[PDB]
Amino acid sequence: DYELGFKFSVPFGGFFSCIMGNPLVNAPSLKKCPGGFSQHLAVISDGCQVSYCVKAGI
Amino acid sequence: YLSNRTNSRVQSFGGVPFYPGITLETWQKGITNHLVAIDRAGLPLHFFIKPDKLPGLPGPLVKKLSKTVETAVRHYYTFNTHPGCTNVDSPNFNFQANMDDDSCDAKVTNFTFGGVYQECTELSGDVLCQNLEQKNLLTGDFSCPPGYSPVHLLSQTHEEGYSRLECKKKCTLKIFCKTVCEDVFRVAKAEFRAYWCVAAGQVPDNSGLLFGGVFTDKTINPMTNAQSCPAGYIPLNLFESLKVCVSLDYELGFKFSVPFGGFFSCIMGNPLVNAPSLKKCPGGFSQHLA
Amino acid sequence: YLSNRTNSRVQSFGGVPFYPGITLETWQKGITNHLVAIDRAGLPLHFFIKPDKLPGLPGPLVKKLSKTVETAVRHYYTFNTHPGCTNVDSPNFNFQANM
Amino acid sequence: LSLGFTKALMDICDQLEKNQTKMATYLAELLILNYGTHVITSVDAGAAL
Ligand SMILES: *[C@@H]1O[C@H](CO)[C@@H](O)[C@H](O)[C@H]1NC(C)=O
Ligand SMILES: *[C@@H]1O[C@H](CO)[C@@H](O)[C@H](O)[C@H]1NC(C)=O
Ligand SMILES: *[C@@H]1O[C@H](CO)[C@@H](O)[C@H](O)[C@H]1NC(C)=O
């Protein structure tokens, strides 16, 4: 819901594991962190780290 | 063969000085004073430097002052506000009209040699591979990251025995069968092959990271002066007893990183210089035991 | 193969500092003070900026003032009242005459 | 503001009026080392275990 999300959203993105690919750019030609968002850990799964590209805009 | 193993860890802040036999109550009733700030929120101090909050003073001059204080913060915030050098640590050969407390044990000027990697090889049985598997994080499996080299840190072997599980059924003469559960001794062995990960050359900052923090359960971590991982660090248990902490994120690492390098055992080689022609400590960093 | 699994979670606000062995009573009797606002209702503060509630001041000017305060709220309400940028977080490279 | 805080602040201000940038910026750096980079406006008196 919009209600308090509009001010508490942190408009994230997405990112696969460090071994898997990525959804966004930095036609499958790229495979690495989708843009910026350096390794801000969220969870480890048997060796691979799962992170995102969490934008914090307006 | 009986073996208890008990742990316990209270961690209170803050009430009456804790002690094991204490009730869960006399703790509470004794909280009258002994209160502690469990959560706090404030503002950047530059916000409080404003002509209203200040007594009689020239208007635009307090704007100047606020900007100066804020820039000083900025300096102290991003890096250690360095005009010329780190100053207070070992005040001998430093420019000390500023303030700067980076670190003291620096002996090398090597580059950002990130990465963490190893190899857990089994010699016999299947016991030790499941827990000595300190697989690489930067790749999600046994590999180095691109631009780095998984050069062999150290090989080592261990010999432990576990009375395994055995619940097997045995037929007597193909008519009836019995299940003869009989757990058997077995000395398993695993050859622990550590492979220190080091960058090959200039790193792209998109996928080249800096880290820091190494200690055992017995050796203290002088990095954090503790026996655990500092905040924002996964303790990667690369070694037999080491938990190599990872600066997986920039956030506080930029100011608490200590941009390490790598080094094999004194019998094994080394990753950096002081085309395999050299075998001795990679550069400086005299024997600072880990 | 036996396996108990117990949970427990009290969440009180607000009486005497809770503790497990407490009765459901000594909680109550000890509520003499230790009261807490469990529910509240009020008005938007722009409503309270009116010439009657204010001391001697120019009439239309308090209308101006109420409109300004209300617009400031509006700004702070919808988005984070941004003239130029996010300011207090990491005050290094931000335009920080706003909030 | 506190007394010591105002003292340090108007000291840096006298340094800037006295045009001595180096001593001024060093005094500001000392201020930030001596009074932290943020002032607290809210705490929660409690305890945990
Ligand atoms: C410790 O070992 C004893 C036997 O000596 C056993 O009865 C007990 O369950 C074990 N654990 C504890 C917590 O005492
Ligand atoms: C816990 O396990 C015991 C057996 O040790 C059983 O008697 C009891 O019902 C279980 N549950 C609780 C709440 O004690
Ligand atoms: C202060 O220093 C600046 C830069 O050197 C100079 O232009 C100015 O004349 C000095 N004095 C005053 C009062 O600003």
Side-chain angles (χ1 to χ4, degrees):
Chain A
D1 197 76
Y2 75 106
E3 213 161 1
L4 177 142
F6 279 163
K7 300 289 279 291
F8 176 50
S9 88
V10 189
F12 63 91
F15 164 55
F16 296 171
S17 58
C18 81
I19 176 175
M20 199 60 199
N22 65 323
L24 268 296
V25 69
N26 188 26
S29 83
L30 63 89
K31 42 168 293 299
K32 69 182 295 295
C33 47
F37 211 73
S38 81
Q39 312 88 332
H40 170 220
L41 188 80
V43 57
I44 178 179
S45 193
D46 52 278
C48 79
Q49 64 276 18
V50 176
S51 302
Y52 278 136
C53 20
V54 184
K55 171 188 184 185
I58 204 169
Chain B
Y1 165 72
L2 164 61
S3 80
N4 288 6
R5 276 188 73 260
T6 305
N7 292 347
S8 179
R9 170 166 58 257
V10 303
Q11 175 183 183
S12 57
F13 43 103
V16 67
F18 200 90
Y19 51 96
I22 198 173
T23 60
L24 307 157
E25 171 186 1
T26 59
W27 161 263
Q28 300 291 160
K29 289 191 171 181
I31 204 181
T32 289
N33 44 359
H34 321 104
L35 289 184
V36 164
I38 79 170
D39 167 29
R40 69 201 93 211
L43 300 178
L45 76 163
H46 87 259
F47 175 99
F48 277 63
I49 312 180
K50 292 299 297 180
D52 57 335
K53 310 295 297 179
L54 276 169
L57 271 193
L61 287 189
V62 314
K63 290 275 187 61
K64 261 174 149 52
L65 175 58
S66 279
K67 177 180 183 174
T68 56
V69 174
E70 181 179 324
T71 49
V73 177
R74 190 172 313 154
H75 276 292
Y76 161 69
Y77 189 73
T78 70
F79 271 137
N80 297 81
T81 188
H82 56 298
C85 188
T86 82
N87 74 328
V88 288
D89 50 306
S90 200
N92 51 4
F93 77 118
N94 309 332
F95 157 57
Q96 301 148 47
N98 66 53
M99 166 56 206
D100 198 331
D101 55 358
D102 269 296
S103 162
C104 177
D105 271 322
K107 275 89 70 177
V108 292
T109 81
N110 289 317
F111 289 87
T112 175
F113 299 140
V116 54
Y117 184 67
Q118 53 88 27
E119 181 196 11
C120 65
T121 49
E122 263 292 335
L123 275 238
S124 196
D126 184 11
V127 176
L128 321 164
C129 169
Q130 322 309 307
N131 311 130
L132 308 192
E133 195 171 351
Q134 320 99 19
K135 72 152 51 183
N136 187 328
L137 190 129
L138 266 174
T139 104
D141 56 357
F142 275 75
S143 168
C144 74
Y148 291 69
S149 68
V151 295
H152 182 47
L153 172 57
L154 172 66
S155 45
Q156 211 49 68
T157 62
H158 267 261
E159 40 179 12
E160 292 82 352
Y162 178 63
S163 300
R164 310 300 140 85
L165 306 172
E166 171 172 343
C167 309
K168 183 53 67 178
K169 209 173 58 175
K170 160 189 173 188
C171 293
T172 101
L173 268 168
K174 304 171 304 177
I175 16 207
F176 197 77
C177 44
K178 57 194 179 181
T179 152
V180 62
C181 185
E182 186 175 1
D183 278 351
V184 69
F185 180 82
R186 197 176 197 90
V187 165
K189 286 185 185 176
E191 175 208 22
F192 166 84
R193 279 234 167 185
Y195 282 72
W196 169 264
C197 188
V198 55
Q202 163 57 38
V203 299
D205 212 349
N206 46 73
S207 68
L209 202 45
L210 199 68
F211 315 109
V214 294
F215 69 97
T216 69
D217 49 14
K218 292 296 167 292
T219 68
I220 312 109
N221 190 19
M223 208 38 11
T224 319
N225 205 11
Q227 300 284 14
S228 47
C229 77
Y233 288 73
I234 279 181
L236 270 179
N237 50 359
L238 168 141
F239 212 75
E240 193 284 329
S241 63
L242 281 297
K243 276 73 62 184
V244 175
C245 287
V246 60
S247 316
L248 191 149
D249 197 76
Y250 75 106
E251 213 161 1
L252 177 143
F254 279 163
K255 300 289 279 291
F256 176 50
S257 88
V258 189
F260 63 91
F263 164 56
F264 296 171
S265 58
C266 81
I267 176 175
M268 199 60 199
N270 65 323
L272 268 296
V273 69
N274 188 26
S277 83
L278 63 89
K279 42 168 293 299
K280 69 183 295 295
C281 47
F285 211 73
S286 82
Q287 312 89 332
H288 170 220
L289 188 80
Chain C
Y1 165 72
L2 164 61
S3 80
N4 288 6
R5 276 188 74 260
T6 305
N7 292 347
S8 179
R9 170 166 58 257
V10 303
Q11 175 183 184
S12 57
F13 43 103
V16 67
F18 201 90
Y19 51 96
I22 198 173
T23 60
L24 307 157
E25 171 186 1
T26 59
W27 162 263
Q28 300 291 160
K29 289 191 171 181
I31 204 181
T32 289
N33 44 359
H34 321 104
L35 289 184
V36 164
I38 79 170
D39 167 29
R40 69 201 93 211
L43 300 178
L45 76 163
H46 87 259
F47 175 99
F48 277 63
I49 312 180
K50 292 299 297 180
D52 57 334
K53 310 295 297 179
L54 276 169
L57 271 193
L61 287 189
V62 314
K63 290 275 187 61
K64 261 174 149 52
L65 175 58
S66 279
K67 177 180 183 174
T68 56
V69 174
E70 181 179 323
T71 49
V73 177
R74 190 172 313 154
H75 276 292
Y76 161 70
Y77 189 73
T78 70
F79 271 137
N80 297 81
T81 188
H82 56 298
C85 188
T86 82
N87 74 328
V88 288
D89 51 306
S90 200
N92 51 3
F93 77 118
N94 309 332
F95 157 57
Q96 301 148 47
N98 66 53
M99 166 56 206
Chain D
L1 310 186
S2 166
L3 200 45
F5 199 61
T6 57
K7 295 293 185 181
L9 279 195
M10 63 186 42
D11 271 20
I12 304 169
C13 189
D14 290 5
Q15 287 313 105
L16 72 88
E17 305 165 14
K18 231 171 181 181
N19 223 347
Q20 291 280 343
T21 285
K22 186 195 62 179
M23 188 73 69
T25 184
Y26 169 58
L27 217 52
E29 201 168 276
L30 171 67
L31 170 74
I32 198 63
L33 167 65
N34 213 359
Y35 276 134
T37 183
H38 272 59
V39 56
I40 298 183
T41 63
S42 173
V43 291
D44 280 26
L49 162 66

